[PDB]
Symmetry: none
Subunit: 164 residues, 3 copies
Amino acid sequence: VIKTVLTYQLDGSNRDFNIPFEYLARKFVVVTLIGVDRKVLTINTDYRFATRTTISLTKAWGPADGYTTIELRRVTSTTDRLVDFTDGSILRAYDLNVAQIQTMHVAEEARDLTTDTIGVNNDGHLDARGRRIVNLANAVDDRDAVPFGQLKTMNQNSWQARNE
Amino acid sequence: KTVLTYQLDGSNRDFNIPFEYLARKFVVVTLIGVDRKVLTINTDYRFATRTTISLTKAWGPADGYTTIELRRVTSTTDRLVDFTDGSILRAYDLNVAQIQTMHVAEEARDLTTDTIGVNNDGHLDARGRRIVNLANAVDDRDAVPFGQLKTMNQNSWQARNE
Amino acid sequence: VIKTVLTYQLDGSNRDFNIPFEYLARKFVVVTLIGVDRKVLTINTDYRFATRTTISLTKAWGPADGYTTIELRRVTSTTDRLVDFTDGSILRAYDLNVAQIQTMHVAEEARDLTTDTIGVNNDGHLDARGRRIVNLANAVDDRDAVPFGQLKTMNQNSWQARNE
């Protein structure tokens, strides 16, 4: 019910932001300014956790700089798992809880990401929202595809056929 | 697998549940007819037997609803297993925790594949649809909209019509 | 963003490609030469793990064979567990580590598949991941996408028209 993307609005001078979701480590919260391009931001110079679930921006970051949204995302690192059971440890239940929480967080981040990929139009048609598809195989064993190179070549073919 | 729809077929009561669910609340049933509406538990459903749900009312197409659903929604904020120090650490708890996480992962997988998804031959399944919104293509491998083509062989398709 | 699916351009006579993703078992690593069609190799007959994190193809497999990229991929069997806890077991640390690793890896696979379908890539453009839209599709509005069959008809009708 709680997503992990939270595309916000810069709307000029607004330095505070909220985190509806919950995270394990500070590093798992990734915030990238959005606009003409996307840029990741660092800690102690762009972020500051004023309080749990409160990101503070050091610079005003209005649209003048060329950005429109913040998109607070949660990304739990997989390689850097929080807990690694050792041979001589005591096996506190806290370790098991932390591990299970981390895996659940990764899965939840997965469901939210798929709703953050290609959308579908209300009428039942795929919608690219003004984007352009790229690097799609120009294989035409079937009757349908949509690459650009063979389009150009067969455009040349049809054009010279007409010129005939 | 997780998402399975059934045609109402006028009057019917029972419907099989293919997938596995750790808790009753996870199974979600929606009347996807004129509008997709959920139904409450122990009011419109009565489960009945593991792997089977029971509807209290017929709910035929004449009632305004054509199809139902058995989507699984495993909770991500509530954990069926919550380990504590003062416990015998039953293995079934360990297995249940892992299975719950895998179930959430499968939910994500099927939700992604709900829209355009890969084919058995590693191909995108548009499923007889068209990409209504598509920006201009300016690369060799890009997907060309219809206007850009209108500024190409379309001219030729008319220049040869005369 | 994807970390468990890497695509390397074959480049004629090359055979070594590293595996940055951590695979629990060899059988969970699949290599699929992408070309005119996707081909799947086998262990000890087409390629071998020269050592951990690297695979040596037996043959060059360059573009001359119609395949351009290798696209080695990770897939962890969700149904089959590498570690299953029993009642009278001994609970080795390795067992807990393996269970947690497998769960986290399947979550990674979920995220990878989330991004595999057409979605925003690093450059910010919907990416076909070198794959081909295959079953049906037709154009109607000038702003929509075009199937290949429509263009084929547009060309062949013009050709036969000229042929009169």
